[PDB]
Amino acid sequence: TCPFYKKIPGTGFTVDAFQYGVVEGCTAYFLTHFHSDHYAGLSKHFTFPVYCSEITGNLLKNKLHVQEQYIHPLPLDTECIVNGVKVVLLDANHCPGAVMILFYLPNGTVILHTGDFRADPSMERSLLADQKVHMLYLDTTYCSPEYTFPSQQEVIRFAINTAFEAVTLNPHALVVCGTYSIGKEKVFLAIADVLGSKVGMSQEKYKTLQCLNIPEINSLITTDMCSSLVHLLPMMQINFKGLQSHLKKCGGKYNQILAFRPTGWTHSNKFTRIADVIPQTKGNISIYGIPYSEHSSYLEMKRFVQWLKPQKIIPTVNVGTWKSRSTMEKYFREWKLEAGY
């Protein structure tokens, strides 16, 4: 049965609610982004209207085989009417195709559902600037001050400089980058660009990437592994055993591997600056964990909410324990007292 925080009151609408069977009273199912925790339950047999971005729609059709007659893609930054209610989709600064959704309810209530997001000051100049929000359904993934990490731009700078140094010292080193979902494509794209290489990957992953509307993508990726010195592998293979095994398969073209695991936050963020990060090494294999986040840091989240000044906040993440729920509610009250709304 569908939890309350996935239902939009005053509407026929749910958000990211595909794993509950037919939801009583739902006339339109919204999907914020193509990550499995949110799409869980969709397939070619789904026969209700799904509302989403163009990019999400391309993934639904090609990877999950959802039939075309039920996919309803909407443009970003454009007022749309859905079953008699005005909606707007806004870029979430998450993975490709990820949206926040603004619902303008018949009674005058305005609701913002952030999906998954990485808050940014550029959001303060979207269509949000114009009007008041009564209810905010908030991605609270890192809602505690211990959660700090660098900008995406500092993390990419580190990765480009690390990769370019290693391969310039040893032309026979291979770079490997781990993946398990869409998102974080800048990591492997920026490294391949500095090295003058295409990124090499499986057919299944190439297919995924071709649904993302990335400009000049045919210029940046390939399935011909032999021609590439940046390879993508499943995240579970990014360990000394799985990397050794991979180096076997490269037919003595390479004698060293430098590998990257983009994670979210890890506790080494509490102690170590990005500049100072070092790898784990075994023989001719080194692995760097890099804190490339597609969710808000604590301070980013706080700034966004104190700018928005919502009347009520409903968390969508960390809601399963009373200790988490208490922690979040205490921070929301602090932010409101400090900013005076």
Residues at the contact surface with Ni ion, assessed by CB under 5 A: 35, 116
CB 127, CB 104: distance < 8 Å: no
Query: How many Å apart are CA 290 and CA 278, to the nearest integer?
Result: 10
Q: Which is nearer to Ni ion, 117 or 254 (CB)?
A: 117
The residues facing 261 across adjacent strands are 289
- Please state the separation of Cα 137 from the chain's center in Å: 17
Counting Cα atoms < 13 Å in the Cβ hemisphere of 276 gives 6
DSSP per residue over 14-26, as a string?
EES--SSSSPTT-
CB 94, min distance to Ni ion, A: 6
Amino acid, res. 262: P
Q: Which is nearer to Ni ion, 39 or 51 (CB)?
A: 39
Q: Which is nearer to Ni ion, 6 or 246 (CB)?
A: 6
Q: Which is nearer to Ni ion, 37 or 338 (CB)?
A: 37
- Helix, strand, or coil (residue 256): strand
CB 75, min distance to Ni ion, A: 22
CB 69, min distance to Ni ion, A: 27
Q: Which is nearer to Ni ion, 116 or 185 (CB)?
A: 116
Amino acid, res. 280: Q
CB 107, min distance to Ni ion, A: 31
- Helix, strand, or coil (residue 183): coil
CB 254, min distance to Ni ion, A: 33
Q: Which is nearer to Ni ion, 116 or 300 (CB)?
A: 116
Q: Which is nearer to Ni ion, 7 or 35 (CB)?
A: 35
Q: Which is nearer to Ni ion, 198 or 295 (CB)?
A: 295
Of the candidates 59, 67, 9, 10, the one whose C-alpha atom is nearest the C-alpha of residue 34 is 59
CB 164, min distance to Ni ion, A: 30
Chain length of the chain: 341
Query: How many Å apart are CA 139 and CA 310, to the nearest integer?
Result: 14
86, with CB counted inside 10 A (0-12, 13-18, 19+), is middle
CB 174, min distance to Ni ion, A: 29
DSSP letter at 198 equals P
Query: How many Å apart are CA 94 and CA 119, to the nearest integer?
Result: 9
CB 11, CB 113: distance < 8 Å: no
CB 116, min distance to Ni ion, A: 4
